[PDB]
Amino acid sequence: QVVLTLWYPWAGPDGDAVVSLAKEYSKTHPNVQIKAQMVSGAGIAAKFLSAVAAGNPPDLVLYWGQDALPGLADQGAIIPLDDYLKDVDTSKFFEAAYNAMKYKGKIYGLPEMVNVRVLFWNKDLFKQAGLDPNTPPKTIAELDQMAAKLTKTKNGTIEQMGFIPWIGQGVPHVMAGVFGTSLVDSNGNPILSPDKNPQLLNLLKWEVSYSDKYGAMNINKFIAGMSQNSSQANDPFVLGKVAMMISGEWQINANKQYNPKLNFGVGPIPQAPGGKPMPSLMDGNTWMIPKGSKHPQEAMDFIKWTMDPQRIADTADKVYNIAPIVEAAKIQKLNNDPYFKEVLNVAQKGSIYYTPAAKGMLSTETAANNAFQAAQYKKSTPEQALKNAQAEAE
Numbered sequence: 001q002v003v004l005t006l007w008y009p010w011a012g013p014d015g016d017a018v019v020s021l022a023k024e025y026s027k028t029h030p031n032v033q034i035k036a037q038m039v040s041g042a043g044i045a046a047k048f049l050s051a052v053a054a055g056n057p058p059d060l061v062l063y064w065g066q067d068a069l070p071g072l073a074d075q076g077a078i079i080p081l082d083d084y085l086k087d088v089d090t091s092k093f094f095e096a097a098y099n100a101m102k103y104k105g106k107i108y109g110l111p112e113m114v115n116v117r118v119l120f121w122n123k124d125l126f127k128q129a130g131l132d133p134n135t136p137p138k139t140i141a142e143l144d145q146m147a148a149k150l151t152k153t154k155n156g157t158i159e160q161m162g163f164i165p166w167i168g169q170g171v172p173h174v175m176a177g178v179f180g181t182s183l184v185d186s187n188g189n190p191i192l193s194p195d196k197n198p199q200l201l202n203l204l205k206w207e208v209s210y211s212d213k214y215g216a217m218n219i220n221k222f223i224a225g226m227s228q229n230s231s232q233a234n235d236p237f238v239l240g241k242v243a244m245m246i247s248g249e250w251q252i253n254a255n256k257q258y259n260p261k262l263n264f265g266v267g268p269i270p271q272a273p274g275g276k277p278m279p280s281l282m283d284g285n286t287w288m289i290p291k292g293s294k295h296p297q298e299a300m301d302f303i304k305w306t307m308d309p310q311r312i313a314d315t316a317d318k319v320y321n322i323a324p325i326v327e328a329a330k331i332q333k334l335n336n337d338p339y340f341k342e343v344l345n346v347a348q349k350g351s352i353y354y355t356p357a358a359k360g361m362l363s364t365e366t367a368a369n370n371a372f373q374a375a376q377y378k379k380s381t382p383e384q385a386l387k388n389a390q391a392e393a394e
């Protein structure tokens with residue numbers, strides 16, 4: 001009778017896992033059929049507000065981060081969940097992941113998975129350059145040095161890249177914390193200009209050094225046709241074309257599924273000057289129920305079903321994420337996996353930081369992303385690009 005519409009933000013294995021959860025829920029709940037539709041970035045990432053405004057929204061969404069939540073809640077595009085949570089023991093969640101759900105006194109989402117950011121490196125290419133394959137770079141300067149050893153060009157044309165800073169999870173909203181800063185201040189206002197954020201300038205100048213060594217056009221010719229900031233069976237790490245890449249812990253899966261023989265290492269992101277050792281953003285996927293959801297109660301009951309310690313441990317194992325439920329992270333089979341053990345060591349030892357909470361986060365990110373790309377393409381200097389972004393953001 002009741003038909004639940006759910007949007008999830010990616011295809012591939014994570015997409016399938018979600019579709020399969022919906023399927024198996026609908027089998028044992030004859031009165032609640034779920035229809036799962038892939039909509040990229042859940043139509044939110046810097047279609048969701050279009051459909052809420054039209055009165056037509058899904059009954060439930062899965063977003064791939066935590067950054068959009070304040071903005072959606074401040075506009076009342078998503079509903080507060082307090083009234084549906086008095087029978088849920090929310091202390092079973094990891095505290096940070098749950099803490100991310102609160103905005104001006106109310107809960108507006110539930111964490112679906114936990115994620116970390118890490119450095120991957122290709123052990124075969126390391127051995128080829130005479131580099132110890134279990135010795136990742138610890139600082140950015142070590143990284144830059146290693147990346148020069150691992151880069152092979154023939155008269156300008158690139159045959160092998162050691163490192164590209166802006167691919168994978170090398171994006172401004174992740175990397176700013178690595179350089180020990182943020183895109184917004186404590187009040188949630190944009191801090192993108194050199195004057196307001198000297199560490200951000202340092203980050204961009206670091207990035208632009210790569211496009212000055214190798215040529216922005218050479219780099220872009222080299223990765224033509226490859227996925228850049230979504231990690232797929234066609235990103236340049238998986239293809240064996242970049243020696244090192246910053247990505248999320250899920251990349252373990254994308255590596256294994258594209259090529260099982262690719263010998264790779266996973267470890268902490270290199271420390272940046274002005275930043276902390278082993279820096280890592282910890283975030284996660286989040287469930288939200290939009291203003292206009294026709295069956296919020298059924299939506300919450302699927303979500304609840306979803307969180308069951310064994311089930312969600314099986315899910316986190318399939319997609320290589322961290323289960324947001326304390327007890328389920330402990331039962332995950334991935335706990336024996338050598339690669340996932342290194343990921344866990346990062347969440348344990350690294351200097352963790354979290355997605356900042358600002359109502360204008362997404363537009364600031366857009367201004368920031370545009371300024372990075374402009375200075376990567378020598379259209380403006382880093383100082384000017386960041387000045388212009390500040391104007392764009394305000």
Ligand SMILES: OC[C@H]1O[C@@H](O[C@H]2[C@H](O)[C@H](O)[C@H](O[C@H]3[C@H](O)[C@H](O)[C@@H](O)O[C@@H]3CO)O[C@@H]2CO)[C@@H](O)[C@@H](O)[C@@H]1O
Nearest residue numbers: 010014045046064065113171229230231250285319321
């Ligand atoms: O691939 C499954 C894996 O995805 C994780 O979410 C990531 C997405 O897949 C994308 O890689 C996404 O990239 C976007 C950034 O968020 C920025 O908005 C901007 O750079 O645009 C890019 C391109 O879309 O990043 C998210 C992580 O924030 C995550 O859901 C994980 O659970 C899952 O296994």
Ligand SMILES: [Zn+2]
Nearest residue numbers: 011012013016
């Ligand atoms: Zn598939």
Ligand SMILES: [Zn+2]
Nearest residue numbers: 065067173365
């Ligand atoms: Zn963000």
Ligand SMILES: [Zn+2]
Nearest residue numbers: 295296297298
């Ligand atoms: Zn209902």
Ligand SMILES: [Zn+2]
Nearest residue numbers: 029301302305
């Ligand atoms: Zn039920």
